[PDB]
Amino acid sequence: TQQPGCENVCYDKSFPISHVRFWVLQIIFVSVPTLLYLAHVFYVMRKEEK
Amino acid sequence: TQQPGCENVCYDKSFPISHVRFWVLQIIFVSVPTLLYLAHVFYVMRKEEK
Known part of the structure; x- marks a missing residue:
């Protein structure tokens, strides 16, 4: 069209x-749920460590 | 405007x-009234002639 x-x-x-x-x-x-799970388990491990 | x-x-x-x-x-x-008058008087003269 003109x-x-x-x-x-x-x-x-x-x-x-x-x-x-x-x-x-x-x-x-x-991808967001995977990143949420990774961070959450990482924090769980860090808290379990102490 | 485009x-x-x-x-x-x-x-x-x-x-x-x-x-x-x-x-x-x-x-x-x-101009029409002038042409009408001219023709009309011309016809009047021609009829008067006979």
Whole structure:
């Protein structure tokens, strides 16, 4: 279209969220429980040590 | 504006009627009564002749 301002609004309507950023959000959310468990068991071991 | 289709619609809103065409309409409308009178008196003279 020759309408200025149509590209990105159509792009934005096409792509609410970019796939790479969405997958980054997915992997970071999946990784969080593992990091929580690792830190928690590490603190448990340190407290058990004393 | 970068909006395509804005020129002529703004031009059209600006110029409902072009001045040259409007004056042509004015002068032709003014001239019509004179031509009517000339033809009418000419026909009157021709009928009077016979």
